[PDB]
Amino acid sequence: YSYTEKKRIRKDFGTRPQVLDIPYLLSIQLDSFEKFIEQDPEGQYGLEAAFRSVFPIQSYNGNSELQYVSYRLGEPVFDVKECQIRGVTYSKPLRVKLRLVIFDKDAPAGTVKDIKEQEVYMGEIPLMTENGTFVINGTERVIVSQLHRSPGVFFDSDKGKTHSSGKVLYNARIIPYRGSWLDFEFDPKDNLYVRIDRRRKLPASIILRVLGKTSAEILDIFFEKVNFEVKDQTLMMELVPERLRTFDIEADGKVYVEKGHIRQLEKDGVNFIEVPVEYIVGKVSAKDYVNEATGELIITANQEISLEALANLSQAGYKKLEVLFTNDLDHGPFMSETLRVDSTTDRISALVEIYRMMRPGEPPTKEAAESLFESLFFSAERYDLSTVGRMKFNSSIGREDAEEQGTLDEVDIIEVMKKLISIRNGKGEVDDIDHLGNRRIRSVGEMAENQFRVGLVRVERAVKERLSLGDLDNVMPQDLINAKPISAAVKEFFGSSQLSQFMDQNNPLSEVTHKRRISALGPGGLTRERAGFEVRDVHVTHYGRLCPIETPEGPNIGLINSLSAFARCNEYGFLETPYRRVVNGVVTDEVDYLSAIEEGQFVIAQANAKLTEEGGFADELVTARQKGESGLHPREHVDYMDVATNQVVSIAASLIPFLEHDDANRALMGANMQRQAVPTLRSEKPLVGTGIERNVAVDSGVTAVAKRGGVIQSVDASRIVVKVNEEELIPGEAGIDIYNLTKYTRSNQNTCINQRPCVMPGEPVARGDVLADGPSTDLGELALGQNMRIAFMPWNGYNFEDSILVSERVVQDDRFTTIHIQELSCVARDTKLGAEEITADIPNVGEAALSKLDESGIVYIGAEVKGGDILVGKVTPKGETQLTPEEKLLRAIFGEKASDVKDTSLRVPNSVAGTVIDVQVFTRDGVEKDKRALEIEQMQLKEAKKDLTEEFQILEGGLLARVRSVLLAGGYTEAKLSSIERKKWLEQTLENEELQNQLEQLAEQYDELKADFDKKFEAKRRKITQGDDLAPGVLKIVKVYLAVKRRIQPGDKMAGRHGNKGVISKINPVEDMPYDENGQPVDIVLNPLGVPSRMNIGQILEVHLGLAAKGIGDKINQMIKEQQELAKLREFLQKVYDLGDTRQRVDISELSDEDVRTLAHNLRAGLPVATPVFDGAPESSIKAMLELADLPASGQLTLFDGRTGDAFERPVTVGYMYMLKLNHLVDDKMHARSTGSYSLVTQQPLGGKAQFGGQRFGEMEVWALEAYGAAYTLQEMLTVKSDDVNGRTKMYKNIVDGNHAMEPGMPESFNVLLKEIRSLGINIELED
Amino acid sequence: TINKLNRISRQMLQEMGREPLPEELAERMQMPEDKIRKVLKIAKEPISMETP
């Protein structure tokens, strides 16, 4: 046990040992970016692959060309925190070494005349943060992996839903990574046709003529030949035994049936069969036949032989006739009929047809047609069947060679055609398009590589154009490359792509799920309107790869999925899952990763399968699955086993206790809504958990984890300093590990990100131990909500439907109080009239509103501000404004007039109250800094100097401690050394050479220390004091951060982990709440009626288990309170941890007295229990735990009404539930508008709370009003509330005058529509 | 003026490895900084009102 785990050991109710621990959750991102960004000698992945695919490039004439040598990544300008502060992208320079080599025109081609080496800048490459995120424009973003179709050839059918009859049409479709798409389909007339990028159908023969195939060659490829001869003036047929198995049969020794089995008479074997002449009449020729004397073609290929043809070939002297084979079941005439319907007769007639169907309405020429067909499929530049695509094609068509090729060839097309005809004939099956072996995962690295290749090509066109000019003596490689296109491509992908999504940062679980999400949408993917039932469905190959539960509930159902717990991506992008090998009947611990294709043949057992002590199966017949179907199979036939019970579900589904007792519909809701939880002030562990929380907390990166072991030298709420152990020190290292903790940083969803130390100074820590807890983390465990006392009963209709009744106590102790940090920006710009200034001299504002402002006009830090308060004072120059004559008289009477500038200042939004916790001022270079700017500037320098000095002090302390140990290897007295003053050590004079040399070495080391510290300080000072690159026309920016404590209130949405959501209806007083015999009131009263209909029974089991766990907690609390002996504490803890026949062996005897006391102290507030999914705690264990805690085994207590004191007639289920506060707050959902802004064109109210807009009265609302008959209300909504400008103004005036009447007019939208219809040359008018 | 500014900006970006700041471009282009900024702001193409 690790120290952090040893502090609080969670009781495990699981029964099945775990062989493979869950891997790092964010591998799918880090591995992909490492593939993209690291240098690979084989040049198959990442930047090297793009460079080698693009370079070398050649001038069209051939004078010179540019070559690629190597690439490197420079040092980032800023760090991640700095990039977030300023608002820049965290990236590294791309510096690529290239050779411009110029040949000699006079010399033979290939002679090197001159070479030029130079390094060129190719743009900035965004970097992946250690947690798998990107910092783009100061924002954390996540790039979602994509599920697409692998390149290659797929065979499909229409399932008999196109033609009038059944007639299931068959098609074959080849799609490359890049290039054109090729389709070979069947028609209702059984002739195979071709499409090239989905255009009008053409006969198939063209695609072979172009490959140089004559008709006879085509029938040779697509047909089997049967031969006939003239032997002894008789017809002779080349008998094959398999073919025969309606006429008279020759070979009189073994005559078969005549015009009325086969194997018995074919056992002997003969070769001579005689056939009637009619047997040739209905059969087609196969070889073109020429007569020397005539010089003409007697019979052509694909022509039906007739009696007259028999006569011609009899007189011509030809005796051997080879003809085609045609059946109705096994072989077909499809190719012959397609040749018959073909109109092209030669290669050129084929390319002209391809050119007409390529470019309709264009004169066809031979050279253009040849170039077009070469570029369509046989050109490397425009066609690239990738390595995955080539493997899929080779596996589909059964080809073994040409693994490196990426361009099609004759063999490929002829094999695709052969497989299509075979699948028609009956041998072969179509492909499952939703099969996970046919779908590929494309991650961040692949997409970045593709976009970088696009940028390279866009640069490369211009490079090739320039090189052809010829004047190249004074040029350099850096004068040929423009980095702007490549930069534009990479920022396009990283900032504007659909799959580059804004980070979800409510809690660690949201981040982890976002990083492990796969989308079928995006570029090269699906569309919501074009997605059907089949793609949204749960396939049998999703087992262990995609979670069947976690998916958005809405239009995106089934199109966005989550990675499974143990899922992985192979080198080709196909999802694979681990399995345990079964060898010689034993279930080994060796693990093999299997993909969808490999999984089908083997039969795989389940983690639920019983096992013996020897390691083999116990039940003779075990439940397994093979080829996608489940069933019962013998023990000896079993090849593989599942590694864990949570293999099929995602992390969020793995965090739901008692998941096996919940319906999948509610499990979906629970998994989705665990990601919307908001961190609270105090993080509380889940009493009933699954044992997964530690993995999520550690792998999310929100916590501070120890890089090396040692003892905690120093602890403070913002800094943890660890003295590294001696065994884990790099030679010549300081020995200090410093962890600076994030304190109150705004998240992407305006939620607090705070790290709280969980260590004490002097305690030992090891590698992987949690030093500080991030948001929603408790001692290294994920803590999304709070443990609430729950009573399942109706209470006076306040829990009607899904409503929740909450006690006031929950509000008092702030169990669901959250901190929200909000950013407010004031931008002082430059206008035509003048430059806007940030000053406190705000016209028409008294000193009451200027109290919180400083001299520079910026609010102080720590000021309590409410709605409407001024944060930053800004005045904008204004031009001359005309005054109405009444206003002129008013100014004449009272002479006050001060309107040189107008008040456009940043103010606190309404209904927002908080404190100012940070103010940041950005000033353009060349603009004077106001006093507040220099105040923050000097504060930043003071902070940086103090912290740099602190790190220097600790590292020097550690280094001098190591040096002291090295000296103590010999041993002297340090009192004599301390007698001389520390600086005076440099003033010592030594005459012996041995001591003098050491003195010089020490002086040099001191100088080097000074130099390195100086360089660090100069770098930081330059970074801090430099100007900010702002938007053109912008002079200053001021950013203010507001912290709001939001408390629970009616309208807030609270939910559990079982899909049980609700809205708080009442904050009940404590006296009114139900209470038990000991006077303890409940905290939340839930409606029981929700449970039976929604089949979420896991919540009841969680309630009972939480009751038992809390009861054990009170037992430990009492046993500590009475200062009872430690031995009985140990006995009680051992009894608790030995409950049930579990896999957990916790020995309290091996724990020290201090460790036992700490464990008991962490267990006072309840005993955490782990119930793994599908390996959870049975009812018997729950009842035993309840019996241990001196609680009823039924889990139901006697509750008394607080209002009356009378006991409820029936026992009520009371326990503890883990409840969450979702990010759906009534504070952010109220909105009301009387009159506000209006649209520019439609003159209608804006939309949204941010715009202070109005609600939409849609078509159905108008329908309802018409059904009621409220004509005047409908007219009010249409005219005087939306777009009748004069009408709405007079309506407001009438309401102010207390008249309550309206003069409706014409809506502006109708006038706009009339103007549009007039603009279309259509006269629309109104008559009287 | 905009085209020559773009050409010099690309040359400087290739030469030092980062976007050239307005003072540096002004020194290279033999014009005051204010003129360079005036050229910079007025080189924009108005956005569409149907951008998703």
- DSSP-assigned states of every residue in A165-190: S----EEEEEE-SBS--EEEEE-TTS
Question: What's the length of chain A?
Answer: 1328
Helix crossing, A347-358 with A366-377: angle to 10°? 70
Helix H or strand E segment including A114 = strand A112-126
Residue A487 backbone dihedrals phi, psi, to 5 degrees: -60, -40
Of A1226, A8, A17, nearest to A607 (Cα)? Answer: A17
Query: Would you list the DSSP string of A1126-1159?
Result: HHHHHHHHHHHHT-SS-S----STTS-HHHHHHH
Q: How far apart are CA A791 and CA A806, in angstroms?
A: 11
Measured CA to CA in angstroms, residue A292 lies from A285, A297, A394, A908 at distances of 19, 10, 45, 103
DSSP-based three-state secondary structure for A1036: strand
Token pair in block for residue A1282: 């939306």
Strand order in the sheet with A202-203: A152-157, A170-175, A182-186, A192-196, A202-203
Structure resolution in Å?
Answer: 2.9
Of A617, A563, A615, nearest to A19 (Cα)? Answer: A615
Q: How far apart are CA A1201 and CA A1101, in angstroms?
A: 25
CA distance A54 to chain B (A): 20
Measured CA to CA in angstroms, residue A1000 lies from A974, A977, A990, A1007, A1099 at distances of 21, 18, 10, 11, 74
Q: How far apart are CA A817 and CA A1046, in angstroms?
A: 6
CB contacts, 8 Å: A125 with chain B = none
CB contacts, 8 Å: A1035 with chain B = none
Q: How far apart are CA A888 and CA A1223, in angstroms?
A: 53
Q: How far apart are CA A598 and CA A67, in angstroms?
A: 42
CA distance A1036 to chain B (A): 16
Instruction: Please indicate whether, in this complex, the C-beta atoms of A121 and B33 are within 8 angstroms of each other.
Output: no
- Across the interface, which of A121, A1032, A1033 has its CB nearest the CB of B17? A121
Instruction: Report the 3 state secondary structure along A969-993.
Output: CCCCCHHHHHHCCCHHHHHCCCCCH
Closest chain A residue to B20, measured at CA: A1029
Tell me how crowded residue A33 is: count the other CB atoms within 10 A of its CB. Answer: 21
CB contacts, 8 Å: B13 with chain A = 121, 483-484
Token pair in block for residue A383: 């066609």
Contact, A1191 vs A1108, CB < 8 A? Answer: yes
Instruction: Please indicate whether, in this complex, the C-beta atoms of B17 and A482 are within 8 angstroms of each other.
Output: no
b/e for A235-255, b at 16 or more Cβ within 10 A?
Answer: bbbebeeeeeeeeebbeeeee
* DSSP annotation of A103: E
Helix crossing, A1153-1162 with A1098-1121: angle to 10°? 130
Could you give the count of Cα atoms lying within 13 Å of A865 in the half-sphere of its Cβ?
Answer: 33
3-state helix, strand, coil in chain A (%, to 5): 30, 25, 45
Instruction: Please indicate whether, in this complex, the C-beta atoms of A478 and B17 are within 8 angstroms of each other.
Output: no
Can you tell me which residue has the tokens 């020759």? A250
CB contacts, 8 Å: A479 with chain B = 11, 14
3-state helix, strand, coil in chain B (%, to 5): 60, 0, 40
Best to test chain B binding among A89, A482, A1242 (most B CBs inside 10 Å): A482
Burial (CB < 10 A; 0-12, 13-18, 19+), residue A536, is middle
Q: How many CB pairs under 8 A join A and B?
A: 29
Contact, A811 vs A1084, CB < 8 A? Answer: no
Can you tell me which residue has the tokens 């923050």? A936
Instruction: Please indicate whether, in this complex, the C-beta atoms of B41 and A481 are within 8 angstroms of each other.
Output: no
- Across the interface, which of B10, B15, B17 has its CB nearest the CB of A482? B10
- Across the interface, which of A478, A1029, A1032 has its CB nearest the CB of B14? A478
CB contacts, 8 Å: B19 with chain A = 1029
Token pair in block for residue A627: 């080829």
Helix crossing, A444-467 with A47-54: angle to 10°? 30
Token pair in block for residue A734: 């300081």
Query: Would you list the DSSP string of A78-91?
Result: S-HHHHHHHT---E
DSSP-based three-state secondary structure for A933: helix
Dihedral, CA atoms, A338, A339, A344, A350, nearest 10 degrees?
A: 70
Closest chain B residue to A1027, measured at CA: B21
Of A842, A813, A822, nearest to A913 (Cα)? Answer: A822
CA distance B10 to chain A (A): 7
Q: How far apart are CA A806 and CA A803, in angstroms?
A: 10
Token pair in block for residue B21: 């700041």
In DSSP terms, A626 is beta-bridged to A603, A629
Burial (CB < 10 A; 0-12, 13-18, 19+), residue A399, is middle
Q: How far apart are CA A549 and CA A650, in angstroms?
A: 8
Q: How far apart are CA A976 and CA A924, in angstroms?
A: 57
Q: How far apart are CA A690 and CA A656, in angstroms?
A: 7
Contact, A226 vs A323, CB < 8 A? Answer: yes
Residue A1205 backbone dihedrals phi, psi, to 5 degrees: 80, 5
Instruction: Please indicate whether, in this complex, the C-beta atoms of A93 and B17 are within 8 angstroms of each other.
Output: yes
Q: How far apart are CA A94 and CA A1056, in angstroms?
A: 48
Of A758, A782, A149, nearest to A508 (Cα)? Answer: A782
Token pair in block for residue A85: 């502060």
Tell me how crowded residue A1105 is: count the other CB atoms within 10 A of its CB. Answer: 27
Residues 6+ positions from A1140 with CB-CB distance below 8 Å? A13, A1177, A1181, A1184
Q: How far apart are CA A405 and CA A403, in angstroms?
A: 6
Helix H or strand E segment including A397 = helix A387-397
DSSP-based three-state secondary structure for A826: strand
Could you give the count of Cα atoms lying within 13 Å of A1207 in the half-sphere of its Cβ?
Answer: 8
Amino acid at A661: H
Contact, A573 vs A388, CB < 8 A? Answer: yes
b/e for A1177-1210, b at 16 or more Cβ within 10 A?
Answer: beeebbbbbbebbebeeebbbebbebeeeeeeee
Best to test chain A binding among B6, B9, B12, B14 (most A CBs inside 10 Å): B14
- Across the interface, which of B13, B33, B41 has its CB nearest the CB of A483? B13
CB contacts, 8 Å: B14 with chain A = 120-121, 478-479, 481-483
- Chain A residues in contact with chain B using a Cβ-Cβ cutoff of 8 Å: 74, 77, 93, 95, 120-121, 478-479, 481-484, 925-926, 1029, 1032-1033
Of A646, A768, A645, A697, nearest to A509 (Cα)? Answer: A697
Of A369, A367, A388, A380, nearest to A408 (Cα)? Answer: A380
Q: How far apart are CA A204 and CA A313, in angstroms?
A: 31
Please work out, in degrees rounded to the nearest 5, the angle formed at the alpha carbon of residue A451 by the alpha carbons of A450 and A453: 65
CB contacts, 8 Å: A120 with chain B = 14
Token pair in block for residue A178: 């890049």
* DSSP annotation of A197: S
Q: How far apart are CA A1294 and CA A1296, in angstroms?
A: 5
Q: How far apart are CA A858 and CA A871, in angstroms?
A: 6
Contact, A342 vs A241, CB < 8 A? Answer: no
Residues 6+ positions from A338 with CB-CB distance below 8 Å? A191, A192, A193, A203, A204, A205
Of A575, A511, A663, nearest to A129 (Cα)? Answer: A511
Token pair in block for residue A423: 């699948």
Inter-residue long-range contacts of A375-379, CB under 8 Å, 24+ positions, other chains counted: A376/A179, A376/A180, A376/A196, A377/A179, A377/A180, A377/A182, A377/A407, A377/A408, A378/A407, A378/A408, A378/A409, A379/A407
Q: How far apart are CA A749 and CA A1222, in angstroms?
A: 12
Which ranges in A894-992 belong to alpha helices (H)? 931-968, 974-979
Helix crossing, A215-222 with A410-425: angle to 10°? 50
Measured CA to CA in angstroms, residue A61 lies from A56, A107, A462, A464, B5 at distances of 15, 15, 15, 10, 32
Burial (CB < 10 A; 0-12, 13-18, 19+), residue A451, is buried
Contact, A351 vs A373, CB < 8 A? Answer: yes
Can you tell me which residue has the tokens 């899904």? A802
CB contacts, 8 Å: A93 with chain B = 17
